Structures are given as C-alpha cells and as structure tokens.
Design a protein around this nucleic acid. Structure first.
Lengths: 95, 98, 79, 127, 155, 206, 114, 101
RNA sequence: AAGAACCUUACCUGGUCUUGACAUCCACGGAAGUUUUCAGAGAUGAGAAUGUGCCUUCGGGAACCGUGAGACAGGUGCUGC
RNA sequence: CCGGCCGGGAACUCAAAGGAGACUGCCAGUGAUAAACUGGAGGAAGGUGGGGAUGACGUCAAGUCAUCAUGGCCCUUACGACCAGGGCUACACACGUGCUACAAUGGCGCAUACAAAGAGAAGCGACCUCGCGAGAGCAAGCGGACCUCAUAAAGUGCGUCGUAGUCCGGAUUGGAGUCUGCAACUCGACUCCAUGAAGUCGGAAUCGCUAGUAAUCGUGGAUCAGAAUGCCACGGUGAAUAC
C-alpha cells in the first residue's frame, strides 16, 4: 500500500498527512489487501471534498465525499470505501 | 513555347480556367499541347482542437492546390496579347515562362 | 566547449578591467556578465559576480582562465 | 505476338509482357536469380505457372517499380495472371480456384490520432 | 467472439517442399516479422535432422510431431463458486498447431549456441522421446488423465 | 460542445468559401490578416445596415468586397456616397484597388446571420427571451424554410445559474452533408454577462 | 603477451585484445597496430616476441594505465579544489553535464537510499 | 495576451529590421575565415555588444496576429492554433477544409 | 507547451518609471529620420552632427517626435461555483 | 559515350479530371407465402468492401477567466511599465508515459537489392576541395512530377566473434572539437578520442492488438536561429489466434 496525497487549493500539513495514513491504516487489513492509493483533497468555496482511488488485485475503486472541515470529509470517505471493499471481497470468495 | 503554369485551390475552378485558355489558343493560332494535369500539393495541418488539455482531441485540415499546364508549341502574336487581359474567375494564379 | 573563434568578454567589464589594473587594485567589481570568460588580464583582482540575488566575491587566481565568471558563482542553494 | 497485363499489389505496380519463346524471365534487365531468386517467397512468381505448364514455353520481360521485395513479387503474380488474356477462361476458370487474380487490396492503414501505429493505444495502466 | 464465425483465410505453402504444414511452422518462430531469417534457420535445422536420423527430411519432421502432439487438453471451467480443470478432446487443426508451438518454446530455452542446431537437437530427441518437448506432452496428459473425473462425454 | 461546425464540414459539397483568392506560402499570411482587418472594420459601422456575410476576392493586385446585406439602401445611403467612403478606407487597409459591391438578400428571416442578430439585438434591450426565439422560428417557417433550430444559452433573464433553451421546428438534419444548412452565431453583451445564440436554418438537400 | 603492465588476453584477436589496456579502445588499437604493420585479425598466441616488441614502444606515446588513471584525476582534483560548478557536482556525487536530477540521477548516485 | 507584450515585440521587429539585415556584415563577412584574422576580426565580436540586444532576429517569439498567443503557432496562416480553426470553419481561410484519407 | 540558453516568462533579487510600453482627445514645440561620443548591468541620462516635403486656408492639412492637464489606459490580478 | 542518353512513340506505368461498378442485383434452400438468413455463381471488390470524417437528447454545477470575449469584485506613483542577472533544468524520494537494452533469429567489417509520403527564398543547398569526423571553403540548380534535402534501413552475399557482463550493453566522466546565436557557466545539439556503469528477460500486479493488424525497420513533417527517445504522417518486412 502506497499513499499519494495531493491537494488542490489545500496545502497539506504534517498533522493532516498522518491523519490520512492512520485512517487509511484502518481500511487496510480490516477489509482487503490493496496495491496503490491516490488521495485528492479539494476545497471549492464551501465543500471540503476528498477523493480516493484504490487499486486492488481485481480492478480499481473510487469514492468521493464532501464534508464539513476536511476531517469529516475523509471520515466519510473511508466509510464509503470500506463498504465497497467488503462488496468486492465477497465477490471474490463465493464459498 | 510559353510554359503557362497555373495553380488554384478549387478543382472545379481550375478546370474551367484552363478551358477558357485552350479554346482561345485554338480560336486564333494553333498547336496546343493540352491541359496536362500535374501532381497537386496536399499541405496537411494537424491542429489541437481544445483551448487547453486533451492532446488526443485534434482536427486535421488540408489545402489541395491543384495545378495545370498548357505548354503551347510555337507562339503567335495574336494570342500573346490575348493571354493577357483575360484573367477572370479570381482564385487562379498564372505564371508564364518563355 | 564552444565559440571556436575568440573568447567572449563584455565591453562593460573589459574596459572596466583596464581602468582597474593600471590604477592599482580596486573595489570588488560588481558585474552581472556571467557570460564572459576569464582573461589573464584580471589575475589577482576581486570580482563580484551576480548569482541571482547577491554579488559573491571571487578572487581571480592564476588557473581559472579556462573558465567563465558564472561558473564560480552558484545560483541555486541546496540544504 | 506480345501480350500485356498490368498487375499491382501493395503500392507497387508491375508491367509484364509475354510472347512465345523459351523459358527465360528477365526483371528490369536482370534475371530472377540476381533479383530475388532464393530470397523471401522465391516461388511466388512461378506459382501461377505450375497451375499451368511453363517449362520452356513462354518467355517474358517485365519492369516493376515501387514497393519492396515481396510487394513487387506479388504484383508480378497478379501481373502475369493478367497477362494471360489471349488464353481465356479455359485457362482462367480453374485459375480462380487457387486465387492469383484477386487484387489483394490490403493497403497500409493510415496512422490515426491518439494511437501510435493505427491500432496501438498508448498503454493506460494501473501498475 | 460473440458473433462472427470468422471467415478463415489460407496460407501460401513452403517453396522448398510442397507443404503448408511446415509453412505454418516457419511462421511460428518468425520473430518480429522476419521470414527470410526464419526460413534460413529451419532449412538448416532439418538437413541436420537427416544426417542425425538417417531418414529423408520431411517425413522425419512429422514423426517428431506425432510423438509431441497431444490428444486431450485440459481447460479451466467456471462452475459454481470455483473453477476446476475439466479435460476436453482437441480438434485436429489445433492439435498440430499446439504441438509445433511446444517445439519452439523448448527451442528458445535449452540453450545451445546457434538457433539452427538448438532446433536440430530436440527434433531428433522428439523422435527418441527423451527431449523436453515430449515432457510437455506427457505432463499435459498426466494432468488430463488425473482429471478424468470431469466430463459429460466418454471419449 | 461536441459537434462539428455545420458550415465548415460541408465546404466543398454545398457551401462556398467566403474568400476566393490564391496565394502561395510567401504572401498567404499577410493577405489573411488584411482580409481579417477589413472584416473587423466592416462589421463595425455596418451593424445597423443588417449585413449577412462578406465575400472577398483578390484578383491580380486588387480586392473585391461584395457585401451581403438586408437593407441595401442605407449601406450606400443617399447617392451612394458611403460605399465609396469605405472604398477609400478599405484601400487604406489592404493594397489599393477595391471595388465594393452589394448583393442584397430578399429574405432577412431565412438567413442564419440575419436571424441571429435580430434576437441578440432584442436580448440586449431587455425583452423576454421566449418571446424572441418563438417569434424568430414562426417567421422563418411561414416564408419557405423547411426547418429551423434556434438555441440560446446564458443567464437568460438574470438568473444566477445558466441554462439552455432550444425551439426547433421542421427538419434540421445535421449529419447529412448534402443538406444546405445555413448556420451562424452572435453574442449578447447584456448587463448579466454574455448570452450566446446560434441559429440553424435548413432549406434544401441539393 | 605483456603490454603496458598486465595485458594478458590469450587467443583473442589483435585489435580486440589490445583494448584491455586502460587507455585504448578499438579505434586507437587499429591505429596503433597499423603503425606497426600487423594484420588485425590474428590471435596474439601466434605473435612472437620479435613482433610484441614493436607493440611496446608504439603504445608508449599514447598515455596508458600508469598515468592515464592519474591525469583524469588531476582534472577532478583541480576542479574540486577551485570550487567551480563542475567541482561541486564532483564534490557531491551529482551529474555534471546538466542532466536530469529530479527523477533518474541514478548511475551517479548508485543505489537507492530508502 | 498582455497588451504590453504585444507592444513589446512590435518594437523588436522594427529594431531587428533596421540594425540587422543592414549591419549583418559584422558577423557573416568579417567574422569568418579570411585574410583578416587580426584585431579587425576581434572588433567584430566586440562592437555587437554596444548594439542594442533587442535587434537579433532570434528574439522574435512570432506570436499570433489576432490574439498574441506565443504558443501553438502556424507559419502558413500567421495565427494561433485557436484562431485558425474558428476562421477555417467560418470559411475565412480559402482552400482549407477538413481532411480525410 | 507544434519545441524555457537571452527572448518566450506570467516567477525571483536588484536597478528604474509615471497619464505611462499600447489607444483616443486637448494645448504647446519639433519634419520625421540619419550618423556618432560619454556614463551605466542595461533600461535610461547628458550630448555632438544631419535633416525638411506633400496644401496655402498658411500659429498649418496630414505623417511622425517631445512637454503639460485629466478623461483614463493597463492587470497572464480573483471567481469556470 | 548502352545513361530514356538522343530522335521518336501516346501503347504502358503514372499524373488528375470526367465516368462505370456492388445493389442481396442473380441462383438454390430455410422462413409467417413477410422482413431476413445460409450457401453458390459471376466478379477487381459480396453482404454497411477496407479506413477516415461525421458525436442524438443529455451526463459530470467535468476542463478552460492564462487563446479570446465577458458579468461582478480588486489594483491603478502599483497586483501597471522597462532593463540586467537568475529561475522555470533545483533532488533523500514517489508515480505516469516512452527510448535503449540485457544479445548468436545477434554484434561487427566489407560488398549490395527494393520504397512511399513530404518540405524548400533572410530557404533547400549539389558537384568540387579540406578535415578521422561533426563540418568548412567555393558554389551551381530550385518557388519546384525538373533542382536540393536524400545513402531508405531491416534484407541479402562473405568473413569474424564461441556464450563471456563477452567484439553484448553506450550509461557516466575526462580531454579535444564543430555549428547556431549578441551569449551555449548555470542550461543546447552534434562529432572525435578515452572511460565501459547497471543490465544475464524481470515480484505481486498490469497493458495493447482480430490482418496488411500486432511486432520490428527506416523515412518525412509541423514547432523552430539552434534544440526530440515526444507528436503528426509515410512506406518496408510481416505473424500467431478466436472452442
């Protein structure tokens, strides 16, 4: 798993970078093994919006979430990605 | 002996143009070696179509500049003034040689 | 590496050498011409070459006549 | 007398000329063995002539330009088939059965925009 | 494909021998579209086959091919929530083409010096049935005969 | 934002060119901006003369500027003194010569430029846009046009978000190339921003 | 079979085996040997000591292993002591001729640190 | 496109036409192989610096003649890559049409 | 971006300028232009020579160049939500 | 003087203008006697022949206020203007797209056969001399089916290398040069000599391609004083496979 954090009009700090990787350490093991991550943070005059593109062994999955103060946006983004990772996991178990 | 070489942009315009010349070259005088067709240049321009990114969005243009030659054999003086003052249907360009 | 006919020096530095070598050693020559070569006429003088935001003083020794003025003036600062 | 067929394939035009004589063949003032006699697809010139007999029957002189070594050689195979016009469909009806008279109009495709060599897409990957 | 049972086109035969079967064989090892470089290697590899086996040249080639061609091929079949290797019998036009592909992939490894003799050594050893090309055929049949438990056909 | 220009795709089939001069690559450049500078000049003062299109030919060190307009009386004015008034200042831009002619059009409601400027002059004097586009299409269909489509986009009455409206009538087949479809576009510099109007008019297929 | 200090290439050809000296490639070796008159495709096992002696003095004019390893060090000692631009690139293990350093820079750095 | 910069290079085309292509002998006639390898050839390199720098023909960016865009130029039409298309589809450039082969 | 050594270039340090690099209008001079010196990194600044027509209403009618006043000019500044 | 070289020939190749042609039109069979389907004949081409152009209503408040136009706001002795120097080329690193490879279906040396498309006037620049070479001098010809760029290369003939980090690899660095431009230090391209790095076919994963395609080989163009491994075109050789 390799993180790639990038911000459009949101210059990422050091406290925000570890807040992403600690949150992305959650949706790690607990849901699926993944190859490569691209995280994009955006501010569009109201919406702190955060996107994420995961690459897995089957294909790719993308989620986006606009939030309140850029911390609740990533907190809503992981819950959007974790449900797509359990749907993809049981699609590849079929026991 | 006049190597009257003429080019234009439209093929339907250049064929009416040389037919306006070879008929006057046989009405007075003689010895016409035909409107022989020469190879046309096909200048192609590939242009980006967006004001920004998407390189793969393009548009290809061209200009077909058609070219015709008459090449009279032996000059008569009644035609050498008649080839001047008859240059209608703008869009064609003549260049005479001797 | 290049300029097969004649080394290159600027007139606002070349004539500023021959007004500053026969009159004794002078001020650090505040010059911007990094494009000029080191000639043997300036050996032993202080030259202030512009590196982008200041004027670094370089003492012209005997053996730098094969180089140019800007090569002894680093532009980008790293670490 | 002298018979003619044009023949062309893959941006290469031939000009074949046949008349009765011995079994010599000459290509642009050269024989076959000094032009491509055991090079790439050496028998593609004679293979319409083992469907018929050719042993010392028809000698021919051809001039070909354009194309490459196999592009010229395929134009002669379409050429001398076109040259067999004084020998009509008693010879030609069992000549359609093995080919030799189709033009084989497969030209090189133009390179399209966005692609590399008219089909090749430039490798959008995930790793 | 979904539609389009494809209109098959023909191959021109080999010049030296009246065969398209060996002309199919020269097209397989023809790397990067170089046929004169392909045909020079195979002609140098089958004249070497004649002196190292005694027979004539072209029928010594298929006697190395009937010793390497398969009769059954195993496939991955998706059924249920898993996927097992069901065996299927091979069509004959694929049977020889699957055989001479196994010859060339054994000829690019088994590294000797020249390519003509690299092909010439195991075209003999296919006939004596100790080369690595026949060990591809027997280990395909070893997997298909172990999977004889999957099949709604008995032939 | 995804279609080809319906005038530019059929340029050898049905539509003619607005420039009919030849030049090789040496004088091709300075002929074209001088062709452009007289096109930006004639649209400046003759906007009230209801000009449709400007066709320019350059025969043998000259220029011939045939003006297609709807009102040929006001472009020459009284006596025809103003068509020679531009002829002094056309010659001022390009090389000398210059013979300016006028070929007037009989139907200002079936020419795609003369429909597109009538709406864009109404939209800047604050009329309702649904009145303007519906009066434009019903005037063209009663005069012989077999099809028309008018599409207006912009703020459209001072709304803070933009939208599009279109009121096609008849057959406007864009993908066929033999169909003579006249198409042009104009701009409305209103108090809310720029409002774009583009008019397609279909007449016949040969 | 002993030229300029080591030179021990057996049964290699003539212009090929001479390039084992630090100081000569294939262009100078076919220029060195043509100045002494020996056919260039002959193995040096064929060559006798009455032919190897003509090779020893001919390679002595173009500088070889002993001093060529130090004349190219004399320049990089000079540039790093003066402090030019190429000296500091030599002083820090970075490329000198203005190549890219953002992405590759890797045959000058060596391995990759993390 | 930054109206001063459109006015900056129209200064450069006037200066490059008056000094050079009139005083181009300073490079191509005296500053070459000659029987003139003395100090007169040495002044040939030196007096070029007293000349104004914005007089070389290699300082022309050759921008568009309608918007002044430095990038996406075409020497055949003299316009940028945007203004060529919107004039070709309008019908302003004669002969130009969409290509297919 | 179909092509950053200067230029491009919008960025940086520093040297400068103000109705201005570009446009129109007013008033007042000067034909414009050409050659050359010094200082300066150059921009600029101080010069030294040369130069004069198109219409006579003639302080002009134009072209181009300097000085002053403002109306403004200018912005690759922000918002493609 | 066997060179289309010269008379000549208008047939042929080709040039580009105008026409013909391919339509399930014909036959057989199935089908609801319908649409249509499968096959065959003829035919250069057979089932919209092959390729391009052409982009339905809309979708993403997708991209662009830095092409331009433009509403509003903001600067207006400065967020405007000029100039020099620097930067956009910085490098512990991460990723994307390409190029060259790891060789013997090859490397190298010599001999040698066949292209298409395109550009050319502050331009293309023969031939002849000089230099190992990049190039330099002299300098014709050409606004070009004429002249120049311009040897196409892979291929083929012969010889060598003997499976080695090797005569593979052409990175890096040193020295010496050329051209362009006022000026190649930061920061150009190319040549010459020397240096000869990783690299021995590539983890998990992943990509393109159904035929003149993939894969390789060279060529040309736009941008441009100079500066492509990119892009856009052109032809050479030419597959495997689709139950």
């Amino acid at each position: 798993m390799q993180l790639n954090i990038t911000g459009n009009n949101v210059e990422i700090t050091e406290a925000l970078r570890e807040f992403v990787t600690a949150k992305f350490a959650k949706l790690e093991q607990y849901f699926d093994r993944i190859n490569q991550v691209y995280v994009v943070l955006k501010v569009e005059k109201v919406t702190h919006t955060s996107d994420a593109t995961l690459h897995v062994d089957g294909g790719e999955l993308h989620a986006s979430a606009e939030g309140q103060d850029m911390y609740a946006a990533i907190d809503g983004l992981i819950d959007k990605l974790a449900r797509q990772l359990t749907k993809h996991k049981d699609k590849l178990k079929q026991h | 002996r006049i190597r009257i070489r003429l080019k234009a942009f439209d093929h339907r315009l250049i064929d009416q143009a040389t037919a306006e010349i070879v008929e006057t070259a046989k009405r007075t005088g003689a010895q016409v070696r035909g409107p022989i067709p020469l190879p046309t240049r096909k200048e192609r321009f590939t242009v980006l179509i967006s004001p920004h990114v998407n390189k793969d969005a393009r548009d290809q243009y061209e200009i077909r500049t058609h070219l015709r030659l008459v090449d009279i054999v032996e000059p008569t003086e009644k035609t050498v003034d008649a080839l001047m003052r008859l240059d209608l249907a703008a869009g064609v360009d003549v260049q005479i040689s001797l | 590496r290049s300029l097969k006919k004649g080394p290159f020096i600027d007139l606002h530095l070349l004539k500023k050498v021959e007004k500053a070598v026969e009159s004794g050693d002078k001020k650090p020559l505040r010059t911007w011409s990094r494009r000029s070569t080191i000639f043997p006429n300036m050996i032993g003088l202080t030259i202030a070459v512009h590196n982008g935001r200041q004027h670094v003083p370089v003492f012209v020794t005997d053996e730098m006549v094969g180089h140019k003025l800007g090569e002894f003036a680093p532009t980008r600062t790293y670490r | 007398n002298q018979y003619y067929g044009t023949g062309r394939r893959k941006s290469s035009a031939a000009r074949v000329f046949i008349k009765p004589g011995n079994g010599k063949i000459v290509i642009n003032q050269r024989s076959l063995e000094q032009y491509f006699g055991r090079e790439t697809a050496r028998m593609v010139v004679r293979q319409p002539l083992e469907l018929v007999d050719m042993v010392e029957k028809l000698d021919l002189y051809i001039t070909v330009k354009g194309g490459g070594i196999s592009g010229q050689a395929g134009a002669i195979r379409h050429g001398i088939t076109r040259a067999l016009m004084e020998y009509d469909e008693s010879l030609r009806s069992e000549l359609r059965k093995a080919g030799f008279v189709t033009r084989d109009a497969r030209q090189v495709e133009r390179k399209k925009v966005g692609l590399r060599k008219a089909r090749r897409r430039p490798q959008f990957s995930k790793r | 494909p979904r539609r389009r049972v494809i209109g098959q086109r023909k191959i021109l035969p080999d010049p030296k021998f009246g065969s398209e079967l060996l002309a199919k064989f020269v097209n397989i090892l023809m790397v990067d579209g170089k046929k004169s470089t392909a045909e020079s290697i195979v002609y140098s590899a089958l004249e070497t086959l004649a002196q190292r086996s005694g027979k004539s040249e072209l029928e010594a080639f298929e006697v190395a091919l009937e010793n390497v061609r398969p009769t059954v091929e195993v496939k991955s079949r998706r059924v249920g929530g898993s996927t097992y290797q069901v065996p299927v019998e091979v069509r004959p036009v694929r049977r020889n083409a699957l055989a001479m592909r196994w010859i060339v992939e054994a000829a690019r490894k088994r590294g000797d010096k020249s390519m003509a003799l690299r092909l010439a050594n195991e075209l003999s050893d296919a006939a004596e049935n100790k080369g690595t090309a026949v060990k591809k055929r027997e280990d395909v049949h070893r997997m298909a005969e172990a999977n004889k438990a999957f099949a709604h056909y008995r032939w | 934002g995804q279609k080809v220009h319906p005038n530019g795709i059929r340029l050898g089939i049905v539509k003619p060119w607005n420039s009919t001069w030849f030049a090789n690559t040496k004088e091709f450049a300075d002929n074209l901006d001088s062709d452009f500078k007289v096109r930006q000049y004639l649209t400046k003062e003759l906007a009230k003369a209801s000009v449709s299109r400007i066709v320019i030919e350059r025969p043998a060190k000259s220029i011939r500027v045939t003006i297609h307009t709807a009102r040929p009386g006001i472009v020459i004015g009284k006596k025809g003194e103003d068509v020679e008034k531009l002829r002094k200042v056309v010659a001022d831009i390009a090389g000398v010569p210059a013979q300016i002619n006028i070929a007037e059009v009989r139907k200002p409601e079936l020419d795609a430029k003369l429909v597109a400027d009538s709406i864009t002059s109404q939209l800047e004097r604050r009329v309702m846009f649904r009145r303007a586009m519906k009066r434009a299409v019903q005037n063209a269909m009663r005069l012989g046009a077999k099809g028309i489509k008018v599409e207006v986009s912009g703020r459209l009455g001072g709304a803070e978000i933009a939208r599009t409206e279109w009121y096609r009538e008849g057959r406007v087949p864009l993908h066929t190339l033999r169909a003579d479809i006249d198409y042009n576009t104009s701009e409305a510099h209103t108090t809310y921003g720029v409002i774009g109007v583009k008019v397609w008019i279909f007449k016949g297929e040969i | 079979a002993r030229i300029a200090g080591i030179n021990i290439p057996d049964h290699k050809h003539a212009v090929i085996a001479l390039t084992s000296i630090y100081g000569v490639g294939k262009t100078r070796s076919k220029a060195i040997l043509a100045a002494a008159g020996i056919a260039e495709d002959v193995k040096i096992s064929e060559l006798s000591e009455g032919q190897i002696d003509t090779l020893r003095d001919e390679v002595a004019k173009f500088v070889v292993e002993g001093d060529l390893r130090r004349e190219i060090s004399m320049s990089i000692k000079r540039l790093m002591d003066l402090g030019c631009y190429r000296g500091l690139r030599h002083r820090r293990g970075l490329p000198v001729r203005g190549q890219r350093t953002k992405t590759n820079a890797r045959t000058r750095k060596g391995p990759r640190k993390p | 496109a930054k109206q001063s910069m459109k006015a900056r290079e129209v200064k450069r085309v006037a200066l490059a036409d008056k000094y050079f292509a009139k005083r181009a002998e300073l490079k191509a006639i005296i500053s070459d192989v000659n029987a003139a390898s003395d100090e007169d050839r040495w002044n040939a390199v030196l007096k070029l610096q007293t000349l104004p720098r914005d007089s070389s023909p290699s300082r022309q960016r050759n921008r568009c003649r309608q918007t002044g865009r430095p990038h996406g130029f075409l020497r055949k039409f003299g316009l940028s890559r945007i203004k060529v298309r919107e004039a070709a589809m309008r019908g302003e450039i004669p002969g130009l049409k969409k290509a297919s082969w």
